[PDB]
């Protein structure tokens, strides 16, 4: 929209997305701006364990369109105050990301179903608390993931999902039969008067 | 019509909230709000006006955008949004004052004016910030098929008509039985009159009742029921019912005796209360039904005993009186108040400009014919009417 | 009783500003308060009735988090957030009716009922959206035992007491000299009478007094003041103050002079005010007294001397009158009003429901009966129906 | 005065904002505020009083600045709101005290205590938090030089003047005609008199005249009329008209005729209602003239045909009367009223210390002396202490 | 508003400044202006007129600039410019005629033309060359609520109405003691006439007041009182008061004794000044309050003692007279002078074109009525009138 | 005496020319004017009264050099300025007010009071704006 | 705290540490900035010796807890207006000593 370029200190509690709303006019880009800030988990109770699930909005792959849409306003604004290679640029690479909208839109549902198929398989409680060591992911992969992708459905091995469990309940039991075993024998250590 | 409300207060806010020295991190909510509105209502004009005296004016919008660069508000940055907030003001004044005349007789509860109707369009639904006000909120409650309600004061509901009913009479007016009432306001004083000073009477005892109707059903009415009326205690000359001859009235206020006030709903009898003066609290009624009885003094004194003479001769009639006033009620349609000036605005919009009478509202805004008879179509036209002079009595104090 | 007020305002400003269109950032804090009282009032039952004819109802929680994602609110939004806002505000309606209906000696300020036992443990304090309104604040500043008030226009304080006194009476009906008022509400009127017209009196000037108490302490209280008798000043026939047979009233208004008025507080005097009419203001007082005299006039006319004979039969006695109203007032203690509406809330559920008497409210809410003996148990217990009562008065209109 | 108002409105919303239980999210902007208000009032001084018995104090500001992060506030913020929110309102009480009883000749509206003139520099310029309500925007306004306007209930404009004039008198005063009233609060009651029912005019017809003028422009005004004089039909001794002797007054009533009632502005006719009594409504007046006609009956019965001779003696005057009463009205300039609570708090303000009368207002707030010679400089005196006082009571609950 | 004096004072400097031959180096400035006025100008179209017989005009703006390229003006670049000066001269001239007819009775004091409206728009706040003349800099300076004034020349502010008030009357007319006045302009001229030539009067001195208010105050006043009237010094035959008789009038004139002047303020003596004839000064007053003594003369001669016989046979009666004239004064609101044609200006606008009567200006503007009920709404109303007569004043000759 | 009248004019010129809106290139003169009067007024201290009931005040001056950026001068360089214009009006009506009320025998046409006797000297000769009425 | 940084001037004769206490108004690191504030060497005489002693509260190994009670309200803090690493480090070291 050719609007003066934000400078977004590193620092402040504020978000760029979250700017760049209160900023602009048009509809369906700040539409899709606002849904990615706020997009937050739920936190659900289901046979005793806990999980975090995404809103419904993202597992039937509705939500795409909501982006493509906003995507396609990019294509009819005259880009202003820009050389003509550069907005040429820019339209061939959302052109490009456009024209496999039905394969974005088949990835993200495959996506959101193995998600919640295999996280239903875990029996201990989990939380959204970042941790120290940090995963290292390059973006160039995900572009090859968007652009590749084909017709063939994936659906998880049951012989590997039952293993996964399998490992996963042993690890929990063995977890609480030690938790059990060090609070008997410190409960009786500290009850015997010992001290030394 | 909420759109225009919805102006209104946002407009409001934002001259409140825009002064000199501010910190932004607190007009955060007002600004996205007047930049959405800006971004809304530019492009498209408007006209108001055309009838009667009233300035035909034209309508543009291009204006820019509040942007958000400061930390403090400044000046200039003031000076500038309160330059816009005043043009949009005068916007709102002027729409409001088109609205306000004109009237329907059929869909008398929908948007009339070219603006209005214009703006009940569904892209400008995008700027609401709230319903807190009393006439507002009422209006949407109504919108959607709900029961609804109005905090008045002193309510005048009770239409100004003098009027008396004999009961007995002479030709000459030498021997009168009847009531006298008076409802002005949201004042009822009844007075019930004897001449014979129940010397004559039946077990000595005047029976004594009067029933006045109610367009419309209130609630929780604190009622003050004070004995000892002060319309008719005063001696009196006036011309007869049909107009050809005068009588006096000579009045001595007695003791009611025996006092009955009766609420009715729906035919049925809601609440009652016997010989009790003071504050009475009811809680839903349509007609008041208040009914006592005159009684001849058992025992007397000589001035006592001369002042009322056996035989025909009159020369000192008795009376009681009673009244009735609405200190605090709830209704459920729009009615006269006087905690603003909602139906003044009314009056004075109409007069000032001369609109010629239309098909509803009776000449001159005279609330007495207007009350007189009371139907569905008028009452949600006089609601909008209201609604749209609240809005008015929002902007300028 | 916080708690109840809160959830009050929470639902008043969810049905306010939740319409298709504001945007998102105007109601993000009452989102975040919804989504707060949600996820603290889920896991939980309650019970209400038990007493009078309240159908004894159970209530759940398992309500989900409303959606925080788009933009505007649309109408499935709208929709969704309505299926459990209409059943906030049945449950806040039974629960707040139910608490309505109980008092008792102590417990005074403390909650009796069930429900708001439950709610105002620990763990659900985490509910408090504000305290903006002033019955909410003023019961906060209440249990810091700090100043509390309010502001009424025309609030009935003096209790009825129709009542007069006979200086010099026989039952010869010729020689009488007392004083009559009447309190009803705020309107306080006194007349003073004298048969003799102060001929045989003393220095030609007779004294009268009027001691009126008052059940509370008003301060900052604006006054209008009236030299002439205006319910007093027409003729009357009274019973006797035992009661045997009738006298005879036939007065005559003259013009008091020394019109002395004192607002006395705990014996001391604070304000004084000398021949004056129209505004009066008292800053702080507790009672009132009155004080007028009665002057034969020096000079005479043969249409006022034909009516004061120095004889012993005498026609038109000698009377002055004052009027004192009380317009507005700020009071410590709560009392009913006329502007305000809580009472008649009050009164109306009680007696829709049918309510078995209780040991602290006189039957049927009735005021003067209640405010003759003030105590402050009852004190303590009406501010609190009257603090429940302010909640539900914003929730259905 | 704006930063005065900005302070009040901060305390008061943060301590209806901050208690235990509620979101951080909340009260953020509360909290950014009240940050930047300690930052800019830290480390100054003042020092307020030094007339009447008044104390003087001196005041510092040390406090320090808030900033806690927790997901639910707790009680120890809320124990430092309560320390610091309770020391700014002791300051801002005792300012407001000083500015009272302080008044100037020229330049009225300009501020005057010394602690007042330091808070209206430039560095006291930030704190501006919000402007909502109707008596701090009016002065807001009014500093922008645009249209002023009050809400009143019943206001008070009339002083208090009984006053009586005669168009025919008798030193004998046996044969009167002339015509009597009053105006008090918010009622003027207005009659006409005469002993032989005008059988000394043509037509047999008496037309008297009244003409009232008002201290200030009214506007939107709706007004309840009434055709039967309340104070002017008892039997009355009053006062003559050199001070010297004594007058007799025995009345009755009989019907206006002709009843013409005109609001005229600059002597020209703007509003005019023929006959209609009940509730009419004026849109922008400033004098008001009343004319009724005494009409004899044409045809008689008995007892008028006697009680009325022809002859010279008289048993009973003729009197008609109109009751005129306004119940609401807006004005552009500032005005008190008996339905808030406003002129109370100067009065009360002023005699708590007693100081000497300033050079401007009348003794101990006399209100019919203010409004006698009713003076541009008293009315801009006026509006700044009845500004002041307003913003005081925003907080004393 | 400012924006029209900024074109009007721009094309009348450009006007000035523009002529064959000047170096360019002395027009930059106003070169500057006239680029930024035309950029900012074009591509706004404009209406004016719709009301009487006023032409209807629309408006285009489509203009080239006034480049640098020159080092001396030339003939050919002087017509260009003055070709564009002329057209924006009858621009301005038309909109102005507009302005001036209308008026309203709220806002008095804002815009009121559509293209007024639009002008005061913000996108047009580039162009204010300066305020240095008197009308626009008091305007400028009452925007932002500061004292005002206005130097006048002979400013009339005392309405026309001449009026005489009898103390001393017979029936016929043969022995009368009175005053005659007569306001006319800014001259008073008061006499004070006796026929006993004080041979009855008390103490042989007859005492003479008379009090003439002003309804706006004014300032720095010299005033030139001169004794020996002239109103009143010749023989007169003029009628009664009720006009059913007529007098006659036999002046001589005496020495005035003891001429005591005085200026008061808000009912406070301000300057005084005793037996002092010529010319004085007074700094404030809104009160003139002239009174006096008549002496008669304590010995005579033949002529004399002829002239004034003791007994009752009068034919030459005495008379003392004094003149007030106001050489010069400031005000502090807009007032009819001599130093211009600014009522003359707006009498001729609105007679020529036969603008019907509105609610505020009385037919035909004469100044009589409009002076004689000043109310601020009024004076509002004029001082924009005038300000827009003098802005058509500076561009006309 | 010519100090005081080229303060009065420089004072009027500014209050009737400095409102939002007007393009620098008409108000450079005047700019320039007033930051020459300021810089040359500094670091002095002024005292009137002691006659009559004029109340003594003392007077400062320390007030920096107005801004020289903005091609229009929007509402805040209005207000700084104003911020001492209303100061300069003051001091300049008290002054003037002071020496109205002091004549003498002697000093004729030299100034009087103390005031104008300091304004008067060399350094101060700086400030004239003109001697246009 | 989102404060501006503590302007300052060599030589005051009161130590920072008092205008920290007296410009923070959270009760936990206040109350500890105090104590830190008036913690001074205890004047005692013992036998006739004269000596420097510590306070009993810190003498009992007490005040280490209401220094992690303040470290630990320190480590939620939102700490606004400071980059991400720098503030994530700072506050897992707060952490790391608590």
């Given at each position: 929209?050719?609007?003066?370029?934000?400078?977004?200190?590193?620092?402040?509690?504020?978000?760029?997305?979250?700017?760049?709303?209160?900023?602009?006019?048009?509809?369906?880009?700040?539409?899709?701006?606002?849904?990615?800030?706020?997009?937050?988990?739920?936190?659900?109770?289901?046979?005793?364990?806990?999980?975090?699930?995404?809103?419904?909005?993202?597992?039937?792959?509705?939500?795409?369109?909501?982006?493509?849409?906003?995507?396609?306003?990019?294509?009819?604004?005259?880009?202003?105050?820009?050389?003509?290679?550069?907005?040429?640029?820019?339209?061939?690479?959302?052109?490009?990301?456009?024209?496999?909208?039905?394969?974005?839109?088949?990835?993200?549902?495959?996506?959101?179903?193995?998600?919640?198929?295999?996280?239903?398989?875990?029996?201990?409680?989990?939380?959204?608390?970042?941790?120290?060591?940090?995963?290292?992911?390059?973006?160039?992969?995900?572009?090859?993931?968007?652009?590749?992708?084909?017709?063939?459905?994936?659906?998880?091995?049951?012989?590997?999902?039952?293993?996964?469990?399998?490992?996963?309940?042993?690890?929990?039991?063995?977890?609480?039969?030690?938790?059990?075993?060090?609070?008997?024998?410190?409960?009786?250590?500290?009850?015997?008067?010992?001290?030394? | 019509?909420?759109?225009?409300?919805?102006?209104?207060?946002?407009?409001?806010?934002?001259?409140?909230?825009?002064?000199?020295?501010?910190?932004?991190?607190?007009?955060?909510?007002?600004?996205?709000?007047?930049?959405?509105?800006?971004?809304?209502?530019?492009?498209?004009?408007?006209?108001?006006?055309?009838?009667?005296?009233?300035?035909?004016?034209?309508?543009?919008?291009?204006?820019?955008?509040?942007?958000?660069?400061?930390?403090?508000?400044?000046?200039?940055?003031?000076?500038?949004?309160?330059?816009?907030?005043?043009?949009?003001?005068?916007?709102?004044?002027?729409?409001?004052?088109?609205?306000?005349?004109?009237?329907?007789?059929?869909?008398?509860?929908?948007?009339?004016?070219?603006?209005?109707?214009?703006?009940?369009?569904?892209?400008?639904?995008?700027?609401?910030?709230?319903?807190?006000?009393?006439?507002?909120?009422?209006?949407?409650?109504?919108?959607?098929?709900?029961?609804?309600?109005?905090?008045?004061?002193?309510?005048?509901?009770?239409?100004?008509?003098?009027?008396?009913?004999?009961?007995?009479?002479?030709?000459?007016?030498?021997?009168?039985?009847?009531?006298?009432?008076?409802?002005?306001?949201?004042?009822?004083?009844?007075?019930?009159?004897?001449?014979?000073?129940?010397?004559?009477?039946?077990?000595?005892?005047?029976?004594?009742?009067?029933?006045?109707?109610?367009?419309?059903?209130?609630?929780?009415?604190?009622?003050?029921?004070?004995?000892?009326?002060?319309?008719?205690?005063?001696?009196?000359?006036?011309?007869?019912?049909?107009?050809?001859t005068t009588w006096f009235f000579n009045p001595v206020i007695l003791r009611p005796n025996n006092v009955e006030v009766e609420f009715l709903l729906n035919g049925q009898i809601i609440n009652t209360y016997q010989a009790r003066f003071g504050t009475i609290v009811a809680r839903n009624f349509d007609t008041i039904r208040l009914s006592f009885q005159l009684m001849r003094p058992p025992n007397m004194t000589p001035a006592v005993a001369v002042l009322f003479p056996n035989a025909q001769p009159f020369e000192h009639h008795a009376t009681v009186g009673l009244t009735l006033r609405i200190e605090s009620a709830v209704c459920e349609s729009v009615l006269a108040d006087a905690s603003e000036t909602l139906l003044a605005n009314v009056t004075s919009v109409r007069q000032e400009y001369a609109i010629p009478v239309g098909p509803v509202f009776p000449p001159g805004m005279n609330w007495t014919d207007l009350i007189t008879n009371y139907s569905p179509s008028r009452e949600d036209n006089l609601q909008?009417?209201?609604?749209?002079?609240?809005?008015?009595?929002?902007?300028?104090?």
């Amino acid at each position: 929209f050719g609007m003066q370029r934000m400078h977004y200190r590193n620092g402040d509690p504020q978000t760029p997305f979250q700017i760049a709303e209160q900023q602009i006019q048009n509809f369906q880009v700040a539409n899709w701006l606002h849904f990615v800030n706020n997009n937050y988990f739920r936190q659900v109770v289901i046979d005793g364990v806990l999980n975090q699930v995404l809103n419904d909005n993202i597992r039937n792959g509705h939500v795409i369109n909501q982006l493509m849409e906003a995507l396609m306003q990019l294509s009819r604004q005259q880009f202003p105050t820009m050389p003509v290679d550069y907005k040429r640029s820019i339209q061939r690479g959302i052109l490009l990301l456009s024209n496999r909208l039905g394969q974005l839109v088949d990835l993200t549902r495959l996506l959101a179903y193995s998600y919640e198929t295999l996280m239903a398989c875990v029996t201990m409680n989990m939380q959204h608390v970042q941790t120290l060591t940090t995963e290292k992911l390059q973006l160039t992969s995900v572009t090859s993931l968007c652009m590749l992708i084909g017709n063939a459905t994936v659906i998880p091995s049951p012989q590997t999902l039952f293993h996964y469990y399998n490992v996963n309940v042993n690890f929990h039991s063995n977890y609480n039969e030690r938790i059990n075993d060090a609070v008997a024998i410190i409960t009786a250590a500290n009850r015997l008067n010992l001290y030394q | 019509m909420d759109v225009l409300y919805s102006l209104s207060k946002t407009l409001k806010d934002a001259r409140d909230k825009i002064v000199e020295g501010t910190l932004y991190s607190n007009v955060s909510d007002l600004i996205q709000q007047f930049n959405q509105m800006i971004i809304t209502m530019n492009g498209n004009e408007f006209q108001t006006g055309g009838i009667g005296n009233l300035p035909i004016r034209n309508w543009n919008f291009n204006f820019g955008l509040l942007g958000t660069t400061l930390l403090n508000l400044d000046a200039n940055y003031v000076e500038t949004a309160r330059n816009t907030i005043d043009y949009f003001v005068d916007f709102v004044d002027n729409v409001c004052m088109d609205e306000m005349v004109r009237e329907s007789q059929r869909n008398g509860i929908a948007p009339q004016s070219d603006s209005l109707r214009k703006l009940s369009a569904i892209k400008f639904k995008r700027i609401n910030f709230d319903n807190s006000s009393e006439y507002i909120e009422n209006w949407n409650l109504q919108n959607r098929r709900q029961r609804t309600g109005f905090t008045f004061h002193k309510p005048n509901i009770f239409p100004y008509s003098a009027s008396f009913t004999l009961n007995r009479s002479q030709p000459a007016h030498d021997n009168l039985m009847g009531t006298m009432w008076l409802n002005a306001g949201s004042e009822i004083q009844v007075a019930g009159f004897d001449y014979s000073c129940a010397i004559n009477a039946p077990a000595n005892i005047q029976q004594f009742e009067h029933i006045v109707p109610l367009r419309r059903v209130l609630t929780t009415a604190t009622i003050t029921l004070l004995p000892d009326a002060e319309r008719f205690s005063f001696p009196r000359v006036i011309n007869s019912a049909d107009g050809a001859t005068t009588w006096f009235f000579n009045p001595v206020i007695l003791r009611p005796n025996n006092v009955e006030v009766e609420f009715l709903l729906n035919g049925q009898i809601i609440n009652t209360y016997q010989a009790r003066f003071g504050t009475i609290v009811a809680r839903n009624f349509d007609t008041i039904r208040l009914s006592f009885q005159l009684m001849r003094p058992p025992n007397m004194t000589p001035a006592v005993a001369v002042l009322f003479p056996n035989a025909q001769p009159f020369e000192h009639h008795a009376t009681v009186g009673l009244t009735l006033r609405i200190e605090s009620a709830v209704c459920e349609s729009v009615l006269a108040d006087a905690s603003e000036t909602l139906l003044a605005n009314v009056t004075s919009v109409r007069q000032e400009y001369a609109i010629p009478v239309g098909p509803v509202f009776p000449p001159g805004m005279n609330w007495t014919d207007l009350i007189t008879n009371y139907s569905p179509s008028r009452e949600d036209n006089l609601q909008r009417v209201f609604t749209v002079a609240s809005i008015r009595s929002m902007l300028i104090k």
